[PDB]
Design an enzyme around this catalytic site. Structure first.
Site, PDB file in Angstrom:
ATOM      1  N   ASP A 150       2.398   8.548  -6.862  1.00 25.44           N
ATOM      2  CA  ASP A 150       2.981   7.478  -6.875  1.00 25.44           C
ATOM      3  C   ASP A 150       4.177   7.656  -7.685  1.00 25.44           C
ATOM      4  O   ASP A 150       4.485   9.004  -7.959  1.00 25.44           O
ATOM      5  CB  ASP A 150       2.248   6.157  -7.080  1.00 25.44           C
ATOM      6  CG  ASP A 150       3.122   5.152  -6.381  1.00 25.44           C
ATOM      7  OD1 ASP A 150       2.547   4.723  -5.214  1.00 25.44           O
ATOM      8  OD2 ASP A 150       4.109   4.722  -6.814  1.00 25.44           O
ATOM      9  N   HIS A 181       6.537   1.004  -9.071  1.00 24.52           N
ATOM     10  CA  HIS A 181       5.509   0.613  -8.066  1.00 24.52           C
ATOM     11  C   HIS A 181       4.239   1.277  -8.430  1.00 24.52           C
ATOM     12  O   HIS A 181       3.207   0.633  -7.994  1.00 24.52           O
ATOM     13  CB  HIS A 181       6.339   1.369  -6.742  1.00 24.52           C
ATOM     14  CG  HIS A 181       5.660   1.394  -5.710  1.00 24.52           C
ATOM     15  ND1 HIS A 181       4.931   2.574  -5.014  1.00 24.52           N
ATOM     16  CD2 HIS A 181       5.558   0.706  -4.307  1.00 24.52           C
ATOM     17  CE1 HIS A 181       4.348   2.212  -4.081  1.00 24.52           C
ATOM     18  NE2 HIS A 181       4.946   1.081  -3.517  1.00 24.52           N
ATOM     19  N   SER A 240       1.410  -0.419   0.597  1.00 25.20           N
ATOM     20  CA  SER A 240       1.119  -0.285  -0.665  1.00 25.20           C
ATOM     21  C   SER A 240       0.283  -0.988  -1.548  1.00 25.20           C
ATOM     22  O   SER A 240      -0.226  -0.418  -2.352  1.00 25.20           O
ATOM     23  CB  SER A 240       2.571   0.055  -1.544  1.00 25.20           C
ATOM     24  OG  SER A 240       3.454   0.979  -0.655  1.00 25.20           O
TER      25      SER A 240
HETATM   26  C1  LIG Z   1      11.835  -5.655  -7.703  1.00 22.38           C
HETATM   27  C2  LIG Z   1      11.147  -4.715  -6.710  1.00 22.38           C
HETATM   28  O1  LIG Z   1      11.329  -3.409  -7.499  1.00 22.38           O
HETATM   29  C3  LIG Z   1      10.371  -2.861  -6.676  1.00 22.38           C
HETATM   30  N1  LIG Z   1      10.358  -1.219  -6.862  1.00 22.38           N
HETATM   31  C4  LIG Z   1       9.494  -0.614  -5.799  1.00 22.38           C
HETATM   32  N2  LIG Z   1       9.016  -1.126  -4.596  1.00 22.38           N
HETATM   33  C5  LIG Z   1       8.166  -0.511  -3.731  1.00 22.38           C
HETATM   34  C6  LIG Z   1       9.116  -0.005  -2.500  1.00 22.38           C
HETATM   35  C7  LIG Z   1       9.405   1.325  -2.446  1.00 22.38           C
HETATM   36  N3  LIG Z   1       8.625   2.170  -3.318  1.00 22.38           N
HETATM   37  C8  LIG Z   1       8.099   3.417  -2.822  1.00 22.38           C
HETATM   38  C9  LIG Z   1       9.478   2.623  -4.489  1.00 22.38           C
HETATM   39  C10 LIG Z   1       9.272  -2.720  -4.577  1.00 22.38           C
HETATM   40  N4  LIG Z   1       8.725  -3.165  -3.616  1.00 22.38           N
HETATM   41  C11 LIG Z   1      10.101  -3.473  -5.551  1.00 22.38           C
HETATM   42  C12 LIG Z   1      10.592  -4.609  -5.547  1.00 22.38           C
HETATM   43  C13 LIG Z   1      10.431  -6.156  -5.051  1.00 22.38           C
HETATM   44  C1  LIG Z   2       3.891   5.548   6.110  1.00 25.40           C
HETATM   45  C2  LIG Z   2       4.577   5.006   5.139  1.00 25.40           C
HETATM   46  O1  LIG Z   2       5.944   5.006   5.455  1.00 25.40           O
HETATM   47  C3  LIG Z   2       6.658   4.233   4.211  1.00 25.40           C
HETATM   48  N1  LIG Z   2       7.957   4.060   4.015  1.00 25.40           N
HETATM   49  C4  LIG Z   2       8.260   3.125   2.996  1.00 25.40           C
HETATM   50  N2  LIG Z   2       7.356   2.764   1.871  1.00 25.40           N
HETATM   51  C5  LIG Z   2       7.676   2.068   0.783  1.00 25.40           C
HETATM   52  C6  LIG Z   2       7.325   0.727   0.984  1.00 25.40           C
HETATM   53  C7  LIG Z   2       6.492   0.254  -0.124  1.00 25.40           C
HETATM   54  N3  LIG Z   2       6.053  -1.025  -0.137  1.00 25.40           N
HETATM   55  C8  LIG Z   2       5.635  -1.807  -1.443  1.00 25.40           C
HETATM   56  C9  LIG Z   2       6.963  -1.927   0.826  1.00 25.40           C
HETATM   57  C10 LIG Z   2       6.019   2.765   2.276  1.00 25.40           C
HETATM   58  N4  LIG Z   2       5.061   2.586   1.541  1.00 25.40           N
HETATM   59  C11 LIG Z   2       5.767   3.795   3.615  1.00 25.40           C
HETATM   60  C12 LIG Z   2       4.384   4.198   3.919  1.00 25.40           C
HETATM   61  C13 LIG Z   2       2.778   4.159   3.911  1.00 25.40           C
END
Ligand SMILES: Cc1oc2ncn(CCCN(C)C)c(=N)c2c1C
Ligand SMILES: Cc1oc2ncn(CCCN(C)C)c(=N)c2c1C
Length: 279
Positions: free
Chosen positions: A39, A69, A224
Site C-alpha cells: 500500500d 491509506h 480497501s
Molecule cells: C481524507 C481522506 O484522505 C484519504 N487518503 C487516501 N484514501 C484512499 C483513496 C485512495 N487511496 C488508494 C490512496 C482516502 N479515502 C482518503 C480520505 C477520505
Molecule cells: C480494483 C480496484 O480498483 C481501484 N481504484 C481505486 N481505489 C482506491 C479507493 C480506495 N478506497 C479507500 C476508496 C481502489 N482501492 C481500487 C481497487 C481494488
C-alpha cells in the site's frame, strides 16, 4: 476475549447479527502470523501498533506513509484497538506514492517481493498479504497475485469501488486470490462496492474507524477497508490452526454468515466474513 465498544466492523465479524458493539475473539489474536500490507506504507511508530509493525520495502524516496491509506488498512489488520488480529506482525511494502498512485510494474514487483521476503521473516503460523489497491484488468497484475498466492501467502484483494463487475479490475479479477467486497453496518452492500462472480467474500467497508498518520485515527470507506478485515481474519484463523494460506479463502467462505446482506446482485456471493468464535 471481549473488546467492548469496538468499531462496528470488528463487532460484525464476530457476530451472527448486525447491531452489536463488542468484538469477541480468541486471545491468541494472530500471534505468530505475519501480514504484509502492500500500500502507501505504514506509520509503524503509531502507538496502536505496539512495535509489531515495520516497513520492509519501498519503491520511492521514502518508506514513510505520507498518505494515511496504508496506515488505516494496517490498523484494521492488526492495531491493538482497531485490528482484527491484535498480535500479528505487520510488514509494510510501499508500492503506492503519497497520492495513492502506483505503476502496475511497481505493484507487481511488490507482490514478487513479498513472495520471497516471507522467507526472511518468522511467521510460523502463516503469511497473509492485504492488497487494498487495483485498477483496470491486467493479465500481468493478475499473474503476479496468483504467484504470490501460490508461494504460500493468503492474498486478500479489494474488489474495487466502481459499483461494477470486478471481472474488469486487477488484481480483483484473479480467480486464485480472495476478492473482497464491502458491506455497511446495516448489512447492505456498500453503495460503491464492486460485485460479480469473482467475489469470494464481503467484509465491513463503510465508515471504518482505524489508525491514521500523525498518530491519529479516522473513519473512511472503501473495499480497501473491507480487505484488511479479511486479511486479519485469515491471520487469526491460521494462528488457531483452523486453516492454511492455500485454503483460508475457502474456509472463510465456508464459515461465513450466509444470505444476510441486501442489494447483492444475482450471481454474486451473499457471504459475510465471520470468525465463528464461541467463548
Ligand atoms: C481524507 C481522506 O484522505 C484519504 N487518503 C487516501 N484514501 C484512499 C483513496 C485512495 N487511496 C488508494 C490512496 C482516502 N479515502 C482518503 C480520505 C477520505
Ligand atoms: C480494483 C480496484 O480498483 C481501484 N481504484 C481505486 N481505489 C482506491 C479507493 C480506495 N478506497 C479507500 C476508496 C481502489 N482501492 C481500487 C481497487 C481494488
Amino acid at each position: 476475549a471481549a473488546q467492548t465498544n469496538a468499531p462496528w466492523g470488528l463487532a460484525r465479524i464476530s457476530s451472527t447479527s448486525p447491531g452489536t458493539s463488542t468484538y469477541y475473539y480468541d486471545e491468541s489474536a494472530g500471534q505468530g502470523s505475519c501480514v504484509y500490507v502492500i500500500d502507501t506504507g505504514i506509520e509503524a511508530s503509531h502507538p496502536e501498533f505496539e512495535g509489531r509493525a515495520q516497513m520492509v520495502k519501498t519503491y520511492y524516496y521514502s518508506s514513510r506513509d505520507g498518505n494515511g491509506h496504508g496506515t488505516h488498512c494496517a490498523g484494521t489488520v492488526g492495531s491493538r484497538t482497531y485490528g482484527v488480529a491484535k498480535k500479528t506482525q505487520l510488514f509494510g511494502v510501499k508500492v503506492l506514492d503519497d497520492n495513492g498512485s502506483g505503476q502496475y510494474s511497481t505493484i507487481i514487483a511488490g507482490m514478487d517481493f513479498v513472495a520471497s521476503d516471507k522467507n526472511n521473516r518468522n511467521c510460523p503460523k502463516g503469511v497473509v498479504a492485504s492488497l487494498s489497491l487495483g485498477g483496470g484488468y491486467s493479465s500481468s497484475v493478475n499473474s503476479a497475485a496468483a504467484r504470490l498466492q501460490s508461494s504460500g501467502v493468503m492474498v486478500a484483494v479489494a474488489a474495487g469501488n466502481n459499483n461494477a463487475d470486478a471481472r474488469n479490475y486487477s488484481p480483483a479479477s484473479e480467480p486464485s486470490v480472495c476478492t473482497v467486497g464491502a458491506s455497511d453496518r446495516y448489512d447492505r452492500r456498500s453503495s460503491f462496492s464492486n460485485y460479480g462472480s469473482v467475489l469470494d467474500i464481503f467484509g465491513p467497508g463503510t465508515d471504518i474507524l482505524s489508525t491514521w498518520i500523525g498518530g491519529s485515527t479516522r473513519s473512511i470507506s472503501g473495499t480497501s477497508m473491507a480487505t484488511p478485515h479479511v486479511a486479519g481474519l485469515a491471520a487469526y484463523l491460521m494462528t488457531l490452526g483452523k486453516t492454511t494460506a492455500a485454503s483460508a479463502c475457502r474456509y472463510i467462505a465456508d464459515t461465513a454468515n450466509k444470505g444476510d446482506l441486501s442489494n447483492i446482485p444475482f450471481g454474486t456471493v451473499n457471504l459475510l466474513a465471520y470468525n465463528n468464535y464461541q467463548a
